[PDB]
Amino acid sequence: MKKWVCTVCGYIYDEDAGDPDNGISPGTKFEELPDDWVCPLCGVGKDQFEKLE
Ligand SMILES: [Zn+2]
């Protein structure tokens, strides 16, 4: 699946990994993250992530 980078702190959201400690199963597409999911390291919102190319 795809990866997305936090443009504030560099955290990589990996769709294959999800973010299960924060309620996000492995395989959750970025688009389907809840609207108020935030970077698990710096706390910024989804708008600050860029999809890896
Ligand atoms: Zn971050």
Author numbering: 1 to 53
The authors write:
Chimeric hybrids derived from the rubredoxins of Pyrococcus furiosus (Pf) and Clostridium pasteurianum (Cp) provide a robust system for the characterization of protein conformational stability and dynamics in a differential mode. A structure design algorithm was applied to the rubredoxins from Pyrococcus furiosus and the mesophilic bacterium Clostridium pasteurianum (Cp) to generate chimeric proteins in which the predicted hybridization interface can preserve each of the interactions in the parental structures. Interchange of the seven nonconserved residues in the metal binding site region between the Cp and Pf A2K rubredoxins yields two complementary hybrid proteins that are accurately represented as a sum of segments from the parental structures. These "cut-and-paste" models match the ultra-high resolution X-ray models to within the structural variability exhibited by the crystallographically nonequivalent molecules in the unit cell.
The metal binding site-swapped Pf A2K rubredoxin crystallized at pH 5.5 in a P21 space group, with eight molecules per asymmetric unit. In contrast, the P212121 crystals used to determine the Pf rubredoxin structure formed at pH 8.5, with a single molecule in the asymmetric unit. The refinement for all reflections out to 1.04 Å, utilizing anisotropic B-factors and all hydrogens, yielded a final R (Rfree) factor of 13.9% (18.0%). The asymmetric unit is arranged as four pairs of dimers. Residues 20–23 from molecules A-D form an asymmetric interaction with the corresponding loop residues of their dimer partners of molecules E-H. All of the first four molecules of the asymmetric unit agree with one another to within less than 0.3 Å for all sidechain and mainchain heavy atoms, when residues 20–26 are excluded. Despite the differences in sequence, space group and pH conditions, the backbone coordinates of molecule A differ from those of the original search model by an rmsd value of only 0.22 Å, with modestly larger values for Molecules B, C and D. In contrast, the deviations from the backbone coordinates of the search model were approximately 0.6 Å larger for molecules E-H. For Molecules A to D of the metal binding site-swapped Pf A2K rubredoxin, sidechains exhibiting dual conformations are Ser 25, Val 44 and Gln 48. The interactions of the three charged residues Lys 29, Glu 31 and Glu 32 vary substantially among the molecules of the asymmetric unit, with the Lys 29 sidechain exhibiting weak electron density. Relative to the X-ray structure, the NMR-derived structure adopts a differing χ1 dihedral angle for Asp 47 and χ2 for Glu 50. The Asp 35 sidechain of the metal binding site-swapped Pf A2K rubredoxin X-ray structure is rotated out toward the solvent phase, away from the Lys 46 Nζ atom, consistent with the findings of the NMR analysis.
